[PDB]
């Protein structure tokens, strides 16, 4: 279900806009303490999504600082891809400006418009805008914001259905770690062990006793 053509040209008149809103991408920045930051690019053509054009970037850096990993990323990706008609950024006044700024230091130019992370507020051009709650135009930026969330969010799924598996495996009384890790390496999520049998459970660590311990707590 895509972003509503009609609302595509109420965004245009809205942003005043020169051009139609056919290409849209989509920034959120989220941040692995310790580790890095990961920028999630999505990209809508014509109002759908265009899954295939979906990139990520990581910043390393222990700490966040968001408004210099939206400069990095505006200027890692504008420099190798054509702008498109717009750009959205997850995120306020601030995530906003630092998108501007980066664009201005690469000499390049292209509508940035940003939804407020607490409130639905929009924000264009150093300006909140606080539009009706049904309106269409905010119900658009909400479905471009929950695209790019859901992008994000899908960076370790993998790594966190392992996590969530060996929680509640963890919960298996005497189990032990090498049978604890040969059932997750094996199912990878609970949804998987969870479809199974015992006897396929039984089979990838050599104790059916265990096996039924393992259905016990699932
Ligand atoms: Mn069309
Ligand atoms: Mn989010």
């Given at each position: 279900?895509?972003?509503?053509?009609?609302?595509?040209?109420?965004?245009?008149?809205?942003?005043?806009?020169?051009?139609?809103?056919?290409?849209?991408?989509?920034?959120?920045?989220?941040?692995?303490?310790?580790?890095?930051?990961?920028?999630?690019?999505?990209?809508?053509?014509?109002?759908?999504?265009?899954?295939?054009?979906?990139?990520?970037?990581?910043?390393?850096?222990?700490?966040?600082?968001?408004?210099?990993?939206?400069?990095?990323?505006?200027?890692?990706?504008?420099?190798?891809?054509?702008?498109?008609?717009?750009?959205?950024?997850?995120?306020?006044?601030?995530?906003?400006?630092?998108?501007?700024?980066?664009?201005?230091?690469?000499?390049?130019?292209?509508?940035?418009?940003?939804?407020?992370?607490?409130?639905?507020?929009?924000?264009?051009?150093?300006?909140?805008?606080?539009?009706?709650?049904?309106?269409?135009?905010?119900?658009?930026?909400?479905?471009?914001?929950?695209?790019?969330?859901?992008?994000?969010?899908?960076?370790?799924?993998?790594?966190?259905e392992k996590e969530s598996l060996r929680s509640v495996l963890d919960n298996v009384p005497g189990i032990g770690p090498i049978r604890k890790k040969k059932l997750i390496e094996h199912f990878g999520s609970l949804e998987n062990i969870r479809?199974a049998?015992?006897?396929?459970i039984?089979?990838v660590i050599?104790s059916?006793?265990i096996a039924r311990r393992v259905l016990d707590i699932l």
């Open positions: 279900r895509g972003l509503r053509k009609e609302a595509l040209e109420e965004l245009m008149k809205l942003l005043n806009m020169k051009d139609f809103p056919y290409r849209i991408e989509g920034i959120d920045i989220s941040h692995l303490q310790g580790k890095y930051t990961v920028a999630s690019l999505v990209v809508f053509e014509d109002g759908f999504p265009k899954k295939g054009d979906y990139r990520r970037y990581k910043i390393e850096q222990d700490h966040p600082d968001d408004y210099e990993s939206i400069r990095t990323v505006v200027k890692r990706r504008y420099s190798k891809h054509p702008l498109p008609n717009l750009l959205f950024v997850d995120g306020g006044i601030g995530q906003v400006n630092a998108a501007i700024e980066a664009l201005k230091e690469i000499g390049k130019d292209c509508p940035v418009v940003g939804l407020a992370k607490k409130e639905e507020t929009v924000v264009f051009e150093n300006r909140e805008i606080h539009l009706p709650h049904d309106h269409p135009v905010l119900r658009l930026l909400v479905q471009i914001r929950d695209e790019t969330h859901r992008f994000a969010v899908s960076y370790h799924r993998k790594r966190r479809s049998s015992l006897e396929e039984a089979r050599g059916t006793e």
